[PDB]
Design a protein around this motif. Structure first.
Motif, PDB file in Angstrom:
ATOM      1  N   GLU A  28      -6.524   3.282   1.708  1.00  0.00           N
ATOM      2  CA  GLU A  28      -5.814   2.180   2.331  1.00  0.00           C
ATOM      3  C   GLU A  28      -6.032   2.200   3.840  1.00  0.00           C
ATOM      4  O   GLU A  28      -6.720   3.062   4.388  1.00  0.00           O
ATOM      5  N   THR A  52       4.720   2.699  -3.941  1.00  0.00           N
ATOM      6  CA  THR A  52       4.762   1.419  -3.245  1.00  0.00           C
ATOM      7  C   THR A  52       6.031   0.663  -3.624  1.00  0.00           C
ATOM      8  O   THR A  52       6.273   0.431  -4.812  1.00  0.00           O
ATOM      9  N   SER A  93       5.790   7.533   2.527  1.00  0.00           N
ATOM     10  CA  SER A  93       5.699   7.062   1.150  1.00  0.00           C
ATOM     11  C   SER A  93       6.000   8.166   0.146  1.00  0.00           C
ATOM     12  O   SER A  93       6.380   7.867  -0.990  1.00  0.00           O
ATOM     13  N   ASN A 115       4.843   5.717  -8.870  1.00  0.00           N
ATOM     14  CA  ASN A 115       4.639   4.570  -7.996  1.00  0.00           C
ATOM     15  C   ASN A 115       5.405   4.788  -6.697  1.00  0.00           C
ATOM     16  O   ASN A 115       6.636   4.872  -6.702  1.00  0.00           O
ATOM     17  N   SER A 120       7.444  -2.548   4.748  1.00  0.00           N
ATOM     18  CA  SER A 120       6.707  -1.336   5.081  1.00  0.00           C
ATOM     19  C   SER A 120       5.214  -1.574   5.249  1.00  0.00           C
ATOM     20  O   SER A 120       4.512  -0.672   5.716  1.00  0.00           O
ATOM     21  N   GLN A 121       4.711  -2.748   4.869  1.00  0.00           N
ATOM     22  CA  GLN A 121       3.301  -3.052   5.080  1.00  0.00           C
ATOM     23  C   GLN A 121       2.961  -3.164   6.561  1.00  0.00           C
ATOM     24  O   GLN A 121       1.803  -2.963   6.944  1.00  0.00           O
ATOM     25  N   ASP A 179       8.019  -5.931   1.182  1.00  0.00           N
ATOM     26  CA  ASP A 179       6.757  -5.800   1.896  1.00  0.00           C
ATOM     27  C   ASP A 179       6.947  -5.488   3.375  1.00  0.00           C
ATOM     28  O   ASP A 179       6.003  -5.635   4.157  1.00  0.00           O
ATOM     29  N   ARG A 239       0.300   2.810   2.265  1.00  0.00           N
ATOM     30  CA  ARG A 239       1.137   1.930   1.462  1.00  0.00           C
ATOM     31  C   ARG A 239       1.572   2.576   0.154  1.00  0.00           C
ATOM     32  O   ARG A 239       2.093   1.884  -0.725  1.00  0.00           O
ATOM     33  N   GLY A 240       1.367   3.880   0.002  1.00  0.00           N
ATOM     34  CA  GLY A 240       1.849   4.600  -1.153  1.00  0.00           C
ATOM     35  C   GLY A 240       0.870   4.772  -2.292  1.00  0.00           C
ATOM     36  O   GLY A 240       1.279   5.222  -3.366  1.00  0.00           O
ATOM     37  N   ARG A 241      -0.400   4.433  -2.099  1.00  0.00           N
ATOM     38  CA  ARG A 241      -1.393   4.594  -3.151  1.00  0.00           C
ATOM     39  C   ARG A 241      -1.810   6.056  -3.268  1.00  0.00           C
ATOM     40  O   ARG A 241      -2.099   6.709  -2.263  1.00  0.00           O
ATOM     41  N   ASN A 300       9.586   7.960  -1.332  1.00  0.00           N
ATOM     42  CA  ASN A 300       9.995   6.890  -2.230  1.00  0.00           C
ATOM     43  C   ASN A 300      10.328   7.380  -3.633  1.00  0.00           C
ATOM     44  O   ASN A 300      10.904   6.617  -4.413  1.00  0.00           O
TER      45      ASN A 300
END
Lengths: 858, 47
Positions: free
Chosen positions: A465, A775, A759, A773, A782-783, A780, A305-307, A762
């Motif tokens: 994640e 995310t 991700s 960032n 992409s979740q 939402d 999720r991009g974290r 982005n």
């Protein structure tokens, strides 16, 4: 001109001329201003070596009422920027997340072909020597003109030692500096790292930015070294009979190791920072290994999720190789370095304890008598010593100086352009292609041999994640070996050679098969130009970006990514399956060589039409056909339906002009059966068993006559990849029907990219430091839904013979001509400069108030 | 450093517009005094 003109142009019926003309046009647009590695080194490096490719994304569903992404923005990048391995001193056997046990070696040989030397003008001294040698003498015993007969053919008494040594070269003055330029471009790109910032097999570990500090490591076993001897001019000419060393020293290309090459350099040029880089780039390589100084600071792990997790869990046991370590070059094995114009007490200004033949000796005596041989460039100048920590800017300063000097003084625009095109073939390194498999509908369970969903080479290591369900690779020894054996270059060639350094044993395995060849650099040209026997070619560049190493490297990386995209397009047109490039390509279905026989035609025509070099040096089947195969790695049960595709679809569209917009998705209601085919299966008793509707996949000839058919084919057969379950929506309605398969029903394959890697798209520039960032804050989608950037199904499951196959309705309710009932991922290329790129443009084009460009503009 | 100011706002932007609209109570009163007004004057003393 990137959009508007090029992004509004699609493919044309004669496809090779269209693709070549487009690539030439895109190369003309590749511009990183040369006066940018002056005020900001890192930004210029990032812009040059890690380009972006913006595109917009969206989904469509027929009866959804759910929002779904419509016009997202992303930035697509390709390639490995560096390589992560276990450290040299790891004595354990527990697998490390992201750390390969070994690394590939892309061994490059010496081409049998010679870069064609263009004509040169002589300097006044060379012209004097030419006039002397072409003069009319009486050859009587009174003068020295008789010495050519009474002493020897090789006498200096008429033309001096210099005109005698350079006589053949001044009778026919020519030069060519392409090989050294290629090696320079490669050294820059491999040291810094092209690509997307991905630095591991794990598809989720990313390199934070261009490295700032490097560390040099020596290895007696892996290194490919050259032997050097240092002489003064007086000492060098005193080891030959009557003095007078040989006139020519260029060896046959098949035997560069047979003799000793020599380089004549005046004492003034020895102190230049470009001189050690002159000795490198013409020698074999790598003579030493480069690592990022600390991996903990410049590596991150990106979640699905991009974290961003900066300290990855096993930093302390990993080494971050540069691409420099993954390539192996063959050049000269013995080189004589002759300094011209120094006294008998000359001192090697670089590494201490090194004594030049005829210079200062070990005891403090002059006129040193021994010609000591030094094994490897590291045994001389200490800037390449073992365990030396250096900042990359100081390392690359000499490289930039060398490039500028050679291109502005000795080389031509043709040589620079040819060097760029050749270097592009080795400028990028990609991992083994990951693919997923949809499976097939339960309604067709008895008509399929590929029922279950599957995936291959989908490896991620982020634990912060949730992990995508398609990433199930476990990095064991056998799997690590297979995945290394699947890695490829822009034209698709893998490597059979590899290195391995753990415990405390350093071992390398080089095969006879080579990924390609580079021409030898003729040292006689260098000696003639530094001794000022040739006139310079200072006014023969005509381009701009040619005097600058970094702009040329940007051109090279752009061309290399274009090579990869065009290769993927060709593999689709040739119907080359992705599995024909895995480790077990030579033991699976015979289709691999049959596909190669067409792929090679595509690549050979492209290389002849665009590059102009000998094709076999840039691509050949030797490594593909010399596959080793790992025994303990069984292939996944997936049909061979998707193409080679190392790049995401938006990059391919950028380089080819393919259009996959939302206008190709069909929403028809259907009341008349046009375009529909009945698919019937009957048992031996005469009873029908299937009776399903179906639409016929287009033939490659049909798309050749109408390229929009390819765009429609993508819309009819593509579904968004789900995060949490292996149930793609498309298999609830549709399946592939192949009469050439014993069990005719199959699913869909879909080259895979993983949410962690996606991700990284982005952010407009590849910098990841826990303040970025990744995310998407207000979407939402992409979740649960992954983008599908794969090339469509292959249109032919037989390289030689064409047979019609169909997309059939698996549930009997969905009519194929009504349009897709699943989520359909449309795409579009977008022209968009990043904020960092715009800030740099303001610096050098509107806020540039340098004294020059103001006062020296006339 | 990621958002470019000339690209446009990335947050929620509140547009506005004036609208002519009479309330239900106001319309009921208008019917009373302009269409249902049958007072003796305005009928017989209009001259």
């Amino acid at each position: 001109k990137t959009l508007y003109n090029y992004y509004s142009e699609g493919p044309s019926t004669p496809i090779m001329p269209h693709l070549v003309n487009r690539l030439r046009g895109l190369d003309a647009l590749a511009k990183v201003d040369a006066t940018l590695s002056k005020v900001d080194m890192n930004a210029a490096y990032i812009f040059a070596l890690r380009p972006t490719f913006p595109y917009s994304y969206g989904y469509k569903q027929r009866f959804s009422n759910r929002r779904l992404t419509t016009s997202a923005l992303c930035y697509a990048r390709t390639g490995l920027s560096s390589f992560l391995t276990v450290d040299k001193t790891y004595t354990s056997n527990s697998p490390l997340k992201g750390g390969s046990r070994g690394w590939p070696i892309f061994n490059v040989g010496v081409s049998p072909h010679v870069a064609e030397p263009h004509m040169r003008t002589l300097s006044p001294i060379g012209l004097e020597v030419f006039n002397l040698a072409t003069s009319q003498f009486s050859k009587t015993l009174l003068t020295a003109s008789s010495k050519v007969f009474t002493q020897s053919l090789y006498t200096a008494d008429i033309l001096s030692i210099f005109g005698e040594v350079f006589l053949p070269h001044v009778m026919q003055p020519v030069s060519n500096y392409t090989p050294i330029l290629v090696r320079a471009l490669l050294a820059l790109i491999h040291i810094l790292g092209s690509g997307s910032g991905n630095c591991s097999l794990s598809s989720s570990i990313f390199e934070s930015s261009i490295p700032q500090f490097l560390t040099i490591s020596h290895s007696t076993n892996m290194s490919n070294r050259t032997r050097y001897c240092l002489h003064t001019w007086s000492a060098y000419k005193d080891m030959f009979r009557n003095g007078i060393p040989p006139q020519s020293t260029f060896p046959p290309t098949l035997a560069p190791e047979g003799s000793s090459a020599r380089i004549l350099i005046p004492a003034a040029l020895v102190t230049s920072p470009m001189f050690p880089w002159l000795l490198v780039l013409v020698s074999s390589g790598p003579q030493f290994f480069l690592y990022s100084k600390d991996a903990s600071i410049n590596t991150v792990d990106i979640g699905s999720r991009g974290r961003i997790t900066s300290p990855i869990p096993d930093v302390a046991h990993l080494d971050l190789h540069r691409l420099w370590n993954l390539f192996r070059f063959d050049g000269y094995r013995y080189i004589d370095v002759v300094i011209v114009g120094v006294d008998r007490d000359y001192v090697w200004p670089y590494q201490n304890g090194v004594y030049v033949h005829g210079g200062k000796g070990p005891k403090g005596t002059d006129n040193y008598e021994n010609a000591d041989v030094h094994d490897g460039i590291g045994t001389i100048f200490s800037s390449f010593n073992n365990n030396v920590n250096v900042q990359t800017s100081d390392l690359l300063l000499g490289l930039s100086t060398l490039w500028n000097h050679i291109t502005t003084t000795y080389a031509t625009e043709e040589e620079v352009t040819m060097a760029i095109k050749i270097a592009a073939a080795f400028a990028l390194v990609y991992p083994v292609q990951p693919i997923v498999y949809s499976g097939c509908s339960r309604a067709l369970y008895n008509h399929t041999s590929y029922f279950q969903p599957s995936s291959e080479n989908c490896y991620t290591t982020d634990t912060a994640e949730v992990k995508s369900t398609w990433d199930t690779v476990e990095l064991s020894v056998q799997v690590n070996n297979a995945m290394v054996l699947g890695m490829t270059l822009p034209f698709g060639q893998p490597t059979v050679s590899s290195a391995q350094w753990f415990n405390n044993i350093d071992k390398a395995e080089i095969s006879m098969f080579k990924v390609g060849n580079l021409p030898l650099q003729n040292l006689d040209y260098l000696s003639l130009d530094m001794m000022e026997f040739y006139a310079p070619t200072t006014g023969q560049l005509y381009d701009i970006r040619s005097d600058s190493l970094i702009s040329s490297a940007h051109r090279t990386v752009n061309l290399g990514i274009g090579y990869t995209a065009l290769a993927d397009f060709f593999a689709y047109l040739a119907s080359v399956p992705a599995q024909s490039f895995y480790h077990n390509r030579m033991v699976t279905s015979p289709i691999s060589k049959q596909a190669y026989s067409v792929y090679e035609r595509f690549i050979e025509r492209f290389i002849d039409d665009f590059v102009g070099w000998g094709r076999c040096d840039l691509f050949n089947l030797d490594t593909l056909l010399g596959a080793k195969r790992i025994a303990g790695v069984a292939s996944s049960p997936i049909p061979w339906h998707c193409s080679l595709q190392r790049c995401p679809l938006p990059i391919i569209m950028h380089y080819t002009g393919l259009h996959f917009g939302q206008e190709h998705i069909r929403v028809r209601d259907v009341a008349g059966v046009e375009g529909l085919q009945q698919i019937v299966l009957r048992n031996d008793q005469g009873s029908i068993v299937l009776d399903a509707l179906g639409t016929a996949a287009p033939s490659r000839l049909a798309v050749k006559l109408d390229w929009s058919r390819l765009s429609a084919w993508y819309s009819d057969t593509t579904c968004a990849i789900p995060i949490s379950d292996r149930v793609m929506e498309i298999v609830n309605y549709a399946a592939i029907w192949d009469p050439t398969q014993e069990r005719r029903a199959t699913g869909f394959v879909y080259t895979y990219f993983s949410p962690n890697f996606l991700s990284s798209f982005n952010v407009s520039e590849p910098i990841f430091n826990k303040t970025i960032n990744l995310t998407p804050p207000y979407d939402d989608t992409s979740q649960t839904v992954i983008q599908n950037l794969s090339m469509p199904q292959m249109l032919s499951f037989d390289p030689y013979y064409e047979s019609t196959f169909y997309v059939v309705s698996a549930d009997n309710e969905w009519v194929p001509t009504s349009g897709p009932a699943w989520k359909v991922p449309y795409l579009e290329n977008v022209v968009k400069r990043s904020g960092r790129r715009l800030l740099a443009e303001l610096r050098i084009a509107s806020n540039n108030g340098s004294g020059d460009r103001t006062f020296l503009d006339d």
